[PDB]
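DATA SHEET
Item: assembly model
Revision: 1
Owner: S.N.
Input lines:
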Amino acid sequence: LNIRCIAKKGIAKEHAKWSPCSAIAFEYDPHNKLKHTDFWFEVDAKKEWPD
Amino acid sequence: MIIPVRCFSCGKVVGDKWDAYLRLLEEGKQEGDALDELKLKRYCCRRMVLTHVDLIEKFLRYNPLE
Amino acid sequence: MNAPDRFELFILPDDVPKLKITPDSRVPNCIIIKFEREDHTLANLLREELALYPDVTFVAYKVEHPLFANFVMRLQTEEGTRPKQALERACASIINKLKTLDHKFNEEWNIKN
Amino acid sequence: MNTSVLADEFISHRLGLIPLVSEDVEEMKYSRDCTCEDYCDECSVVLELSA
Amino acid sequence: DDTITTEDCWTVISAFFEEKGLVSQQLDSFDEFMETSIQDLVWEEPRLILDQPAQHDNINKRYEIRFGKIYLSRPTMTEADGTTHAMFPQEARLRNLTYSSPVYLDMEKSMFTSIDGNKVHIGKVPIMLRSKFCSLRTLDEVDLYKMKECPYDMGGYFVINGSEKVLIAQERSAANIVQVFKKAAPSPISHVAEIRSALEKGSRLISTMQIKLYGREDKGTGRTIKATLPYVKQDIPIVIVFRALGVVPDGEILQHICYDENDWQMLEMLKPCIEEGFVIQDKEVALDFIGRRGSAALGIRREKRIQYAKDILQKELLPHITQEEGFETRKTFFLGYMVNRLLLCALERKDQDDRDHFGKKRLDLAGPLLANLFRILFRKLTREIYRYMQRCIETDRDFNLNLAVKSTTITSGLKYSLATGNWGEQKKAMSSRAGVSQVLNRYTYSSTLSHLRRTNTPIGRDGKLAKPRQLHNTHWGLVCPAETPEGQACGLVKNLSLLSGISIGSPSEPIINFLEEWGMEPLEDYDPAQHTKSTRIFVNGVWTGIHRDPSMLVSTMRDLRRSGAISPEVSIIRDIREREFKIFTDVGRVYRPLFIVEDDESKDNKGELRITKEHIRKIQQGYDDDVYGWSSLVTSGVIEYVDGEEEETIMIAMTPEDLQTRSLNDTAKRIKPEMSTSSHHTFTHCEIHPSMILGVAASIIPFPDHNQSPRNTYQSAMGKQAMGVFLTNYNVRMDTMANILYYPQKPLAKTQAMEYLKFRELPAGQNAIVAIACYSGYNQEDSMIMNQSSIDRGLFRSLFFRSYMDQEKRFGISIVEEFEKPTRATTLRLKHGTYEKLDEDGLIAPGVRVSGDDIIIGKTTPIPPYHTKRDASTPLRSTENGIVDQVLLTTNQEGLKFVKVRMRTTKVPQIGDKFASRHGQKGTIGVTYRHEDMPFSAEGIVPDLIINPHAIPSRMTVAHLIECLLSKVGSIRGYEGDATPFTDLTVDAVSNLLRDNGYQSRGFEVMYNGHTGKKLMAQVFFGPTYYQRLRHMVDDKIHARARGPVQVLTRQPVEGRSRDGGLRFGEMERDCMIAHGAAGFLKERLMEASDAFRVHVCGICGLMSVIANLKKNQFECRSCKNKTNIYQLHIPYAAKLLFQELMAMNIAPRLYTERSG
Amino acid sequence: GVKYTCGACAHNFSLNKSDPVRCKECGHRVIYKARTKRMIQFDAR
RNA sequence: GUUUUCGUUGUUUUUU
Ligand SMILES: [Mg+2]
Ligand SMILES: [Zn+2]
Ligand SMILES: [Zn+2]
Ligand SMILES: [Zn+2]
Ligand SMILES: [Zn+2]
């Protein structure tokens, strides 16, 4: 294997090979106190859904 | 064949773990704890290593032209 | 063999501008702003920032097509402030917010590790 | 020159995916922002491989 | 000994495949071919006599040639320059050769002038690539490592001219069985008792006979019976042929027919037959009667007429029973009973004979097919010796005898049958079967394996019917019930089951001895009064004995087949109700290994398995504790082979649960038979696994039993065309198409038969992340939304390879074209493509970035007469790009350089690309979105792909949900999950474990809108699934044509996306346009977009009979001398063609530009 | 210039339009056009 | 040198 390589400045937007991150976790309202998700449930909403 | 350089679902540096993964395998070790040892936290990264199929060993055991 | 290109998502062509404002006489003190080379990231931010402005009477944006990194934003303000001026105000406000964000982050990063 | 049993597109794309230590990538000029013909170091870091 | 669990059954199947495998039937078939079949076909007439009766005083100068032993040689390809080498299959593929070996015979001579050894080359036989005489048979893997063969590539095919052709086995009805059918009412025939009476050995057709019943009820006079014997020109009454066949009195005819003498209706119904045959009262008149209608020549007179009638009653009448003398009494008894069965079926006292039950059908493998073709070709081999030893016998020369043997006799029939596909001779192109041999597919690895285990029913659409296409209960566990082709061939072209094996053909004589061991009562003894309730015994369909105590003999035969003295595959069936018994050893009857539940109620093992954990442990050893192989289990009487005809007479347990006859409220379990009235059940057998009713493809699907059967069939169909990795040495193969995945991934959901399939080692598909919602609105209507990050990282990236084959040709003997760089001077009629890529020998270098409109293989061809050379190059395909993978330079068989250039391309998914799941879930890409725009999880995790929820209400794939759930669980826990059908897994437990995984039991999880980060109100079911790339892309169908090449004859746009084809405008499109009022639009579609020529026709005759010249401006109607009354017509060229053939058929279609009125 | 390589004997060589297809030393008629030493450039993405 | 030159029979498998 004999290879030469050219690296140029880039961003994740143009390729995941320049991606600075794999995934970024973003959260808020850790109890759904703002009512942004339904807590879909078969029996009950608070207990079916974890903390 | 050949584990991806970057994790398809996530994008984590994963390539430099295969030999380490085999090392962990050799000692009759469970799979999941070994993957956790490999810093495989996201189950996407986890099954990417768990379910990767490398195939070059049969290809390489062919005697090449040179 | 027909799909579009990737660097154009932010590279400005000569003929079209980054910012094309046209008067929206539909309601008084309203304009329509075409941001080429843009997407939800800046659009939603500016939309919320303008919505927080009391002068801003109408604020909305739309990415007319997801297959093109561009969007258009309709902005009406009260009879006092112009839509464009509200836009510079929103941009500068988010500037100062980002400054404070970066400063606090850096300080507590340093004290943390 | 390559005498392996793998496609060169394979290894090339994989090499692109490889992150490079880039604490100063900001100073690097873009391949389109930099005015030079072909590549210069300022907009292009050269890598090499021989095995 | 203990209970039998599922893993023990898996171990049993491991023994099964370690001895048999899945090619064992083909291997043993082709080995039987060149170990018993070939020799018998050679010696089926071992006597060749000539003579010169005259003088030499008087003499019989007897040239007499006796046949002898055949010879088999190891493959040697004999280069065209005397540099003979032993041939290797790799070289055969590289140089486009045939995997064929030379054969030789000993046709010795014996000269007998009366007063009154030699080794010739018969021919070259193509060989199946894993027979015992294959070049690489004894050679070990390291030797294989030197000859570059894929270890998973498992042979079973034939190599001819570098093309791999497989002989598809053909299913046909088993012969020598009574077939009574209900003839149509508006016909003199009511019931047709048919039997294809043909020699059991060889399984080849000799003759057949159909006895037709005349008359109606209160209509059509008496119930007379007159059948047309083979090669007779009239329906002769059956009582008459009984007179002719030896039994002239009618009471003998009834003793042959009547066997329930308590019945009066059949007596009074056969009375009219006696009345009509009463004109015949002896054997002489009956035989003359037959001979008159016997289609023989005229002038044969009564004596030879009777002799020929007797012969045709002897030969070609029940030939499977006998063709020689002495058994014409057996002929009388058999015909009498067959007529009796006809009459009983006519009375409807028995259900009419079924036409699909496999017990009356066999499968002709490659073995007997090649046997039949060799029979044909050799029957045209033995005769050209006669037709040359006559032109030389008159000269009585010192004949070389090595020039009358045209050895290529058996080369060309096989070459044409295996190459073109027609099993016969090219001269007899008509009435030939097409498709029995086809090119082996290596698109994927299964595209070979499953391809090697097809079956086909070559009936034809002559009468459409659903019975050849409809699944039947007898197909249970014997065939795959989901693998079927599309519309034209759907239902037909059927696959085996997983554990099936085909009878390779054992001598029937051992079975004859086993049966006669029990005091058989001859057919002559069979009497209506004596044998009022005795058991009629049949072999292979031939009725060969009677018995009154059949229980002992059937028990002994069953236990003996359990032992092994009887060939373990030989079918034993006991028709208790109809006082009959039948043994089948003919080739083509397919058997499944059933666990032997003790059926004789004499122990607790009755209702349990003879095979126990002792046998399981012995198999787990792989050997015997003093070998225990699969044949060990089969011959130990704990597992036995069973056919469908046996299956319908046996009662089988499904799972190890219902073996012992048994004596709550769970919504995650299946159902066994209720056992409410039938308090007892003595299941004589149990399947090794119900999941073995599946097929090779069906052993792939995760829980195929939780999804709709139509979707299961769609899965089966799409599985063979799904992208993957076919062979390890794909590179050394120069194939039309090769597809290799960048990153093969073993499925998270797995079967256990998977383990046997080695799907970890050749996996087809990847485990990618999917979430269910309607986020983009583009997911509708079979479209999916893709993560661009995974694509950039290379998810489902792949490699495609295309091999172009080129060769120099011989116009004469020395007139040859050459591979050279075309130029503007030496080469005429050049092409706009760039020739520069060619360097010295018209061959591009390996590794160059090739594209379309660029010549890759340059060729120059002589012009028939200084500047007499034409471009004959074959450039790369126009809309194809890539880099040359490989360039192979060799020669042909004799002397011309043959080049194989494989080009390599990287394929990446794009909007519109086709994909499918393992649950029939098929669609194209609708739009691709980047990471930032799609919503993320609480941990910020996005899926790789997004699907349409609307599939679930419509397509209803519960198994897909189970697969995704198990996939999440396995990925979190880090192990391979099992999805074997008919197992005890429960979804609720998996949900509980997901709770243990710290994740929502039903798989829901909050997504946060990618554009806003806002918590999407619903919690999204989001996790991994195993999907597969499919052969169909978007850019291979994109094709626009404003103007291109036109067909040479039609002067209209060509058809085919390859050659810039135009859109064929269907007639319904014309009709809808007419209903749309599209006059001008359709006109220009037929005028400017289609053929349009202008002509000059006459105004007097009104024909195109006008010499026309625009430049001369002369238009003379030679028909009518018309020059001024000539009119120009701009009409489609197809109209000109129509007018042309109308003229050519002496029809005068006088076009008129006016109105007669 | 136009170089050629043998099947598995690893013989490297060069035929012209004067000789038949025959690996000069091994006597192997399955020969292969030796790859071009010329560089090929890729996009690594 | 504007311009500028490929086809069919038969066979198999296919595609909502
Ligand atoms: Mg369609
Ligand atoms: Zn991951
Ligand atoms: Zn530069
Ligand atoms: Zn005329
Ligand atoms: Zn050599």
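QC remark: The helical segments of chain B are 18-26, 31-37, 43-50, 56-60.
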